Design a protein around this ligand. Structure first.
Ligand SMILES: CC(=O)N[C@@H]1[C@@H](O[C@@H]2O[C@H](CO)[C@H](O)[C@H](O[C@]3(C(=O)O)C[C@H](O)[C@@H](NC(C)=O)[C@H]([C@H](O)[C@H](O)CO)O3)[C@H]2F)[C@H](O)[C@@H](CO)O[C@H]1O
Ligand SMILES: [Cl-]
Length: 228
């Protein structure tokens, strides 16, 4: 078991989209009659005129290899660029923004570390749209620091440090490579503010318990060992 996000919200959205595609197939929508491996949930634009980011059930065979990028979701419910792009003319998808958004809201309660939630809130309050990671900055692929990152600048396939539900080291999808692209500039380093945000969270365990973090809330609170 790795100290890493299970990406449980994204897993649930993909499974719900697989059911929805199957239902649409049964209603006669031929292009949706596919194996489950062909269907994922992504947050993205759609075809021409569908210009807002919405949750949609995509046929992967209709996605482009690049980036109209598509976004996946972390276990605190933030949308982050994933591999691929929407074909604005040829996309095969079903927009299902309400059911999928509701599943994200439910998942956040289950899976989002209150320590990470506090860090994210700090960042969004100060720089709207940003989330917290301890990751790379511009043109340096070694140094990490707590920063508020514009979500568009993160890569879902790259794991970066985040706060566990014990306020300890964890890793989450949505990270930086430390490359030198314009996107690599889109962050605000906030070591003191983010650390204070994380430190301000009340423990789920008592002062007489040891917090062992888990990929779902609550963490394990084990009775502290005695002076045996
Ligand atoms: C704002 C500024 O110029 N402050 C001077 C200090 O420079 C800042 O030092 C921090 C170190 O914590 C960063 O190196 C920093 O760079 C970044 C960042 O936060 O990582 C680089 C980002 O690309 C940029 N974001 C953009 C362009 O979208 C941010 C952003 O400009 C900034 O966070 C806004 O507050 O900055 C860097 F700017 C400097 O170290 C001290 C003393 O020398 O003086 C400050 O005034
Ligand atoms: Cl996560």
């Amino acid at each position: 078991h790795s100290p890493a996000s299970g990406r449980y919200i994204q897993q649930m959205l993909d499974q719900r989209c697989q059911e929805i595609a199957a239902e649409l197939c049964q209603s006669g929508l031929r292009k949706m009659c596919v194996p489950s491996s062909r269907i994922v949930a992504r947050n993205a634009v759609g075809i021409t005129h569908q210009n807002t980011l919405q949750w949609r059930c995509f046929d992967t065979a209709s996605l482009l290899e690049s980036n109209n990028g598509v976004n996946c979701v972390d276990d605190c419910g933030h949308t982050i660029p994933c591999p691929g792009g929407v074909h604005r003319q040829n996309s095969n998808h079903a927009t299902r923004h309400e059911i999928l958004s509701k599943l994200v809201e439910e998942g956040v309660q289950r899976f989002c570390s209150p320590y990470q939630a506090s860090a994210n809130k700090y960042c969004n309050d100060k720089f709207p749209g940003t989330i917290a990671r301890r990751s790379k900055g511009f043109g340096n692929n070694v140094e990490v620091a707590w920063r508020c990152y514009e979500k568009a600048s993160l890569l879902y396939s790259v794991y970066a440090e985040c706060a566990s539900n014990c306020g300890t080291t964890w890793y989450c999808p949505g990270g930086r490579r430390g490359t030198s692209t314009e996107l690599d500039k889109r962050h605000y380093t906030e070591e003191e503010g983010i650390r204070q945000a994380i430190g301000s969270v009340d423990s789920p365990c008592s002062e007489v318990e040891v917090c062992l973090p888990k990929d779902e809330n609550p963490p394990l609170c084990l009775d502290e060992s005695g002076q045996i």
